């Protein structure tokens, strides 16, 4: 019963918008009633006592219903697509704004690309469902459900005939659909083999021509083509049947209905109008059955993505209860970690009960080998994930009782692989401040030594950098990220391998600038280059989940053995 | 008149296969005649003197035509797609085998990827054209062209009415199509802007969340959505009209025809059957006009690719006249170049009248800086492009009078970026010999020191390497190419920067193996690594299109000044 559940949950979204949905559904009901009423009036016009009598009276009604059908076919078709577009945009906006504001750990668990693809494809399929369903298939469903009583009360024998014809047509349609799907699934493998071979051999034309392999490649292609012919032969009959079934069924239904009508009229139990009515009934029944069968197929195909979308929306629906928690204000800087421990891959906890203190105006440099616990410590400093054990204290206030909107503002962190939007370089720089202006941007660029690089080259400081910074090299991206970070000028600052892809000449000036800008601020520095560490005030050693050394630059000469090994190494 | 020309040139390909095309066209003509004849017989059945008289006689004929229509709808639909598939495969095979055997210079001029895409897309569009045209639109064209005389002779007033209705419907269809295309072209830009923004901001979720930019991004998305709503508002009416026009026209035509029929019958100048016939005539005319208009739109869209395909096929149609030219046999090796000169980019000829001699059993190493004339010389050795000036002599026979199938076999050349198929590594190695066997493959791999690397790792020597060798590193690809070249063991051999991506340890053994295997053969070696040149017998210096030095390793110590500079440099 998954199909009906997804139909209901897709109709709930339309039920969010009540007025337009009510207008569309009542319009569809009226269109269905007119669609049923038209053939009866056509039969009334045609019968008209042979054709001798009053023709004007039924003809006027028939023309009026025809004009109403024209106007409704315009109005319903316009309203349905307007509603579908508006609802798809609203749903996409709501899902996006609920998805973007939710922790990263879920993004790494699922995959941001996967979430984006799910959202886009599911919204497109849902829009198609909304657009087609309301108008055409609400009309068809109501039309058939109301047509059953009319045939039941008019010409019971032909009512049973129509029901039998519809059932047989639907069953044959399902059979053809299944046996065509099987054949297509069988053929696709040979098709893909053929075209992959063609592409691979054409791309490497030089190798083929250099070894006199033209004859062999042509023979292989002919063999693959013969394989396709053999694989396609069994399914040609079903392909032809799928192509022709609609006209087959229309002609067969018309023939059966007309033959029975003539047989009954010859016996005097029926009249011409009741036959002209049932011919139209059969024709419209066949057409609408075909349409709704195609719709059901499309929905069955799209169910796989729709269930995933609904699962993601249900999962990404609730966060912590909103409240005006006591956010830290006038942050000065004193960071203590006590007994903190976390399990990153749900097993094999990295950090083992680390504890340390960071004083005002002091810079801390963390160094280690293959141990990944320093990155986990940095993440805990930003409070990416709440620690299962241990505590973090800043300014005498618990980090767990501080609003994220203030904690994010209080710390500026630049890491190894900075990301840039596909906007202009000025726009990318501008995100440091909420408002900012055009004045201090140049000063920040000069401080990061990016103003000179971006002024003349790359067509001024307004060019559109490629996606994920694909139009610039790693050094330029790192310089831009440094400029953004120093423009943010948060009192708490973090470097994480953001200066590991540049030569010494610019590295020295970048380090000098970031140190001068951080004289009054506290910074956490992590890097594999043992050149910016010599200017630090407190060096910490992070090895295999443990902290073993805590001291200044002048006290680490004789402190630690492995640390001494690293110091003598470089 | 381009459209009719492409239609004619697309029908020529079907005209290649005569019997099946004749059967399909005569079947389509019969189907069209039956389609026209059916409404007249329906009117005959309905009229039947009110409905009092002989009903069996017309009803039997009508049922017979219905059954024939069913059988024809199956048979024609099957035959059309069988023919279309066979013809598309044949055309693709012919075009591929004519394209793959033609010089590279055209491939670089156009682009092998572009040629492949043109061929595939054009063949797909041509197959769709063949499949739809024959059955459905040959039936429609013949049906309308024959329907005009029938209406002309039956009920001239209604013939004129039908012609007017058809003309008006086609004109309104064209208007709606144009005004929908304009709106879609206007909307696409805002649509793409919206979705590009969504993708860019979701991908960089960490940056957005780290700077409290969620509100700004949501506001920007809402602004883009409002822009889409504003851009889509003007075209909703035309979208609704395009959706509804078919039912609009069907209902309007039926209403007009029935009203005129009742008006004429009231005056006694017409009968019921002639009205029931014209209602069906109008219905089928509307349906077939819609179908053929959609077909014309599709063909107009596909013309852009079809003209390019025809241009490429005409260009890639003729080569030099086939002949049993005197191919060189029992090649021993003595290569002389005299006064050869070529213009690569049609301007600024690289090589300037070079002349040199290469003796049996002697290896020649060509060295140079930024000069690209050495690569042109190598290409001329393989006779990639015929020299405009100068001559090349081998074995006392002109290279211009030697078959390519022998010249390619006589020389084995491995260059900087070797290409490998997406087959197994064994299959890639096997192309050295036409037949070969599984025995000497292992010996060749051992000689190239690739057997040990490929035996245990990468799941034996049968794994499917990725496209263009994407599953292996540059060193492994170079080793595989060396193995293939030494398996070919041609008496003339060429290295072109095929050992410039490996460390010294394997480089020394690779050079030793290739030198030992080339003791009895003549080789041309080009590389930027000045380590394999010390074992050469004749070193040539190629600078800015000129040859200035010609001597052995022992005579180049005091020969040349710039060459001496390169020698002392490395
Ligand atoms: C007056 C003429 C009436 C004709 C009615 C014919 C009924 C025969 C169907 C059984 C054949 C079968 O086997 O199934 C047919 C398949 C079922 O596919 P499925 O179940 O959804 O597959 C996913 C499994 N989960 O598609 C159909 O349902 C096509 C029939 C839809 C038209 C019926 C109109 C009313 C539907 C909505 C009512 C609230
Ligand atoms: C008994 C009822 C008969 C109705 C006939 C209606 C004719 C009106 C068309 C003019 C309108 C217009 O303006 O053009 C209509 C556009 C022309 O597009 P195009 O020229 O190809 O654009 C590319 C420029 N290069 O598409 C059509 O042609 C649609 C009409 C095709 C149906 C006609 C059947 C016979 C066609 C083949 C005959 C050998």
Q: What is the 3-class SS of B361-372, one letter each residue? A: CCCEEEECCCCC
Q: Quickly count: other Cβ atoms within 10 Å of residue B249's Cβ.
A: 25
CA dist list (Å): B406 to A188, A207, A446, A539, B239: 40, 15, 66, 72, 64
Which two tokens mark A101?
């504001």
Chain A nearest C-alpha distance from B344 (Å): 18
- The domain spanning residue A55 has which CATH number? 1.20.1560.10
Q: Looking up tokens 């469903």, which residue turns up?
A: A141
DSSP state of A466: P
DSSP string, A103-126: -HHHHHHH-HHHHHHHHHHHHHHH
Phi, psi dihedral angles at A47 (to 5 degrees): -70, -65
Q: Is A115 on the interface with B (CB under 8 A)?
A: yes
Q: Is B201 on the interface with A (CB under 8 A)?
A: yes
The answer to whether position B270 is within a domain reads: yes
DSSP state of B399: G
Q: Which of B155, B150, B151, B165 is nearest to B263 (CA)?
A: B155
Cα separation, B38 vs B58, in Å, equals: 11
Say how many Å lie between the CA of residue B238 and the centre of ligand 2: 21
The count of C-alpha atoms lying within 13 angstroms of the C-alpha of B477, restricted to the half-sphere facing its C-beta, is 23
Cα separation, A537 vs B39, in Å, equals: 98
- Is A363 known as a binding-site position? no
Q: Mapping DSSP to helix (H, G, I), strand (E, B) and coil, where does residue B415 land? A: coil
**Nearest CA owner, ligand 2 atom 26:** B293
Does residue A14 contact residue A83 with C-beta atoms inside 8 Å? yes
Among the candidates A285, A316, A347, a domain finishes at A316
Residues A345 and A254 in one domain: no
Q: Does the distance separating the beta carbons of B421 and A200 come in below 8 Å?
A: yes
- Tell which A residues from 2 to 41 touch B, by Cβ distance under 8 Å: none
Burial profile A182-202: b = 16 or more Cβ within 10 angstroms, e = fewer? ebeeeeeebeeebeebbbbbb
DSSP state of B424: B
The strands making up B389-394's β-sheet, listed across from edge to edge, are B354-358, B335-341, B389-394, B397-398
Residues B170 and B304 in one domain: yes
Chain B nearest C-alpha distance from A35 (Å): 12
Cα separation, B188 vs B6, in Å, equals: 30
Which residue of chain A is at minimal alpha-carbon distance from B111? A203
The answer to whether position A525 is within a domain reads: yes
Q: Which residues line ligand 2 (CB under 6 A)?
A: B 3, 141, 144, 147-148, 162-163, 166-167, 170-171, 174, 285, 289, 292-293, 296, 300
- Is B375 known as a binding-site position? yes
Residues A301 and A359 in one domain: no
Does residue B533 contact residue B539 with C-beta atoms inside 8 Å? yes
Say how many Å lie between the CA of residue A2 and the centre of ligand 1: 15
Residues B292 and B364 in one domain: no
DSSP state of A468: G
Does residue A563 contact residue A543 with C-beta atoms inside 8 Å? no
Q: Is A78 on the interface with B (CB under 8 A)?
A: yes
The answer to whether position A327 is within a domain reads: no
CB of A3 within 6 A of ligand 1: the answer is: yes
Which two tokens mark B353?
């009248």
Does residue B286 contact residue B246 with C-beta atoms inside 8 Å? yes
H or E stretch covering A250: helix A236-266
Residues A116 and A233 in one domain: yes
Q: Which residues pair with B341 in a beta bridge?
A: B389
Cα separation, B405 vs B400, in Å, equals: 13
Q: Mapping DSSP to helix (H, G, I), strand (E, B) and coil, where does residue B523 land? A: strand
Counting from 1 in the atom list of ligand 1, the atom nearest the Cα of A288 is: 32
Which two tokens mark A400?
């767990």
The answer to whether position A517 is within a domain reads: yes
What's the domain range around A83?
A: 1-316
Residues A16 and A105 in one domain: yes
Number of domains in chain B: 2
- Is B560 known as a binding-site position? no
Q: Which ligand is nearest to the CA of B175?
A: 2
Chain A nearest C-alpha distance from B304 (Å): 22
Beta-carbon contacts of residue A36 (< 8 Å; ≥ 6 apart): A143, A146, A147, A150
Q: Which residues pair with B391 in a beta bridge?
A: B338
Does residue A460 contact residue A404 with C-beta atoms inside 8 Å? no
Counting from 1 in the atom list of ligand 1, the atom nearest the Cα of A144 is: 1
Does residue A90 contact residue A13 with C-beta atoms inside 8 Å? no
Residues B208 and B349 in one domain: no
Residue in B59, B70, B265 closest to A259 by CB:
B59
Please give the angle made by the CA atoms of A165, A170 and A174, to the nearest 5 degrees.
Answer: 150
Residues A61 and A151 in one domain: yes
Cα separation, B312 vs A454, in Å, equals: 44
DSSP state of B464: B
The answer to whether position B148 is within a domain reads: yes
Which residue of chain B is at minimal alpha-carbon distance from A215? B97
Residues A354 and A228 in one domain: no
Beta-carbon contacts of residue B118 (< 8 Å; ≥ 6 apart): B305, B308, B309, B312
Among the candidates A288, A316, A344, a domain finishes at A316
The answer to whether position B81 is within a domain reads: yes
Which chain B positions have a beta carbon within 8 Å of A204's beta carbon? 419-421, 468
How many contacts does A have with B, using Cβ atoms within 8 A?
253
DSSP state of A398: E
Residues B168 and B278 in one domain: yes
| Distance between first and last Cα of chain B | 67
Cα separation, B1 vs B14, in Å, equals: 21
Which chain B positions have a beta carbon within 8 Å of A422's beta carbon? 196, 200
Q: Is A208 on the interface with B (CB under 8 A)?
A: yes
The answer to whether position B322 is within a domain reads: no
Q: Which of B498, B495, B493, B484 is nearest to B444 (CA)?
A: B484
Q: Does the distance separating the beta carbons of B73 and A244 come in below 8 Å?
A: yes
Say how many Å lie between the CA of residue A292 and the centre of ligand 1: 8
- In chain B, the largest separation of any two C-alpha atoms, in whole Å, equals 121
- The domain spanning residue B461 has which CATH number? 3.40.50.300
Residues B295 and B391 in one domain: no
Cα separation, A472 vs A480, in Å, equals: 10
Q: Which of A54, A242, A265, A277 is nearest to A153 (CA)?
A: A277
Cα separation, A444 vs A439, in Å, equals: 9
- Is A368 known as a binding-site position? yes
Rounded (10°) angle between helices B18-47 and B272-315 = 160
Q: Does the distance separating the beta carbons of B70 and A45 come in below 8 Å?
A: no
Cα separation, B87 vs B130, in Å, equals: 9
Among the candidates A316, A343, A365, a domain finishes at A316
Q: Which of A242, A250, A247 is nearest to A177 (CA)?
A: A242
Q: Which of A273, A279, A232 is nearest to A260 (CA)?
A: A279
Q: Does the distance separating the beta carbons of A248 and B70 come in below 8 Å?
A: yes
Residues A197 and A261 in one domain: yes
Does residue A132 contact residue A295 with C-beta atoms inside 8 Å? yes
CB of A70 within 6 A of ligand 1: the answer is: no
CA dist list (Å): B529 to A241, B160, B175, B368, B507: 67, 86, 68, 11, 10
Residue in A70, A112, A211 closest to B205 by CB:
A112
CB of A300 within 6 A of ligand 1: the answer is: yes
The answer to whether position B330 is within a domain reads: no
Which residue of chain B is at minimal alpha-carbon distance from A403? B212
Which two tokens mark B28?
């389509």
């Amino acid at each position: 019963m998954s199909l009906l559940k997804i139909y209901w949950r897709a109709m709930q979204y339309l039920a969010v918008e009540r007025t337009a949905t009510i207008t569309m559904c009542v319009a569809s009901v009226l269109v269905a009633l007119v669609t049923l009423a038209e053939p009866v009036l056509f039969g009334r016009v045609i019968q008209s006592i042979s054709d001798k009598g009053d023709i004007f009276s039924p003809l006027l009604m028939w023309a009026a219903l025809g004009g109403f059908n024209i106007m409704a076919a315009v109005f319903v078709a316009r309203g349905a697509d307007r509603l579908a577009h508006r609802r798809r945009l609203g749903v996409m906006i709501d899902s996006y704004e609920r998805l973007i504001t939710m922790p990263l750990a879920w993004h790494q668990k699922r995959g941001t690309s996967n979430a984006l693809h799910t959202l886009i494809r599911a919204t497109d399929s849902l829009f198609t469902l909304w657009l087609e369903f309301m108008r055409q298939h609400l009309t068809t469903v109501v039309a058939l459900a109301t047509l059953i009583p009319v045939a039941m009360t008019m010409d019971m024998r032909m009512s049973l005939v129509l029901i039998v014809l519809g059932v047989i047509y639907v069953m044959i349609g399902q059979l053809v659909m299944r046996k065509t799907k099987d054949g297509q699934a069988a053929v696709e493998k040979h098709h893909h083999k053929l075209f992959e071979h063609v592409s691979d051999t054409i791309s490497n034309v030089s190798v083929v021509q250099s070894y006199n392999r033209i004859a062999s490649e042509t023979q292989a292609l002919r063999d693959y083509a013969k394989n396709l012919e053999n694989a396609q032969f069994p399914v040609l009959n079903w392909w032809a049947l799928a192509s022709g079934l609609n006209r087959m069924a229309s002609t067969f239904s018309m023939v059966v209905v007309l033959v029975l009508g003539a047989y009954f009229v010859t016996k005097g139990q029926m009249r011409v109008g009741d036959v002209i009515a049932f011919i139209g009934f059969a024709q419209l029944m066949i057409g609408r059955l075909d349409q709704i069968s195609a719709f059901i197929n499309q929905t069955v195909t799209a169910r796989a993505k729709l269930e995933e979308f609904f699962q993601m929306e249900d999962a990404t629906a609730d966060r912590q209860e909103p409240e005006n928690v006591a956010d830290l204000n006038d942050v000065k800087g004193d960071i203590v970690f006590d007994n903190v421990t976390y399990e990153f891959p749900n097993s094999g906890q990295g950090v083992y009960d680390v504890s340390f203190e960071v004083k005002p105006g002091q810079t801390v440099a963390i160094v280690g080998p293959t141990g990944a616990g320093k990155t986990t410590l940095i993440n805990l400093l930003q409070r990416v994930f709440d620690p299962a054990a241990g505590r973090i204290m800043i300014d005498g206030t618990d980090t767990r009782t501080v609003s994220r909107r203030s904690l994010r503002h209080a710390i500026a962190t630049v890491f190894q692989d900075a990301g840039l939007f596909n906007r202009s370089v000025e726009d990318n720089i501008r995100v440091g401040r909420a408002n900012a202006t055009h004045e201090e941007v140049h000063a920040a660029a000069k401080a990061a030594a990016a103003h000179d690089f971006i002024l003349a080259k790359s067509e001024g400081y307004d060019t559109f950098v490629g996606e994920r910074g694909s139009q610039l090299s790693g050094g330029e991206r790192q310089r831009l990220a440094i400029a953004r970070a120093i423009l943010k000028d948060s009192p708490i600052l973090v470097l994480d391998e953001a200066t590991s892809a540049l030569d010494v000449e610019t590295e020295e000036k970048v380090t000098q600038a970031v140190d001068e800008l951080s004289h009054n601020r506290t910074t956490f520095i992590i890097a594999h280059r043992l050149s910016t560490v010599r200017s630090a005030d407190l060096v910490l050693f992070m090895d295999k989940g443990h902290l073993v050394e805590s001291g200044s630059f002048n006290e680490l000469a004789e402190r630690g053995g492995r640390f001494s090994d690293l110091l003598r190494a470089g």
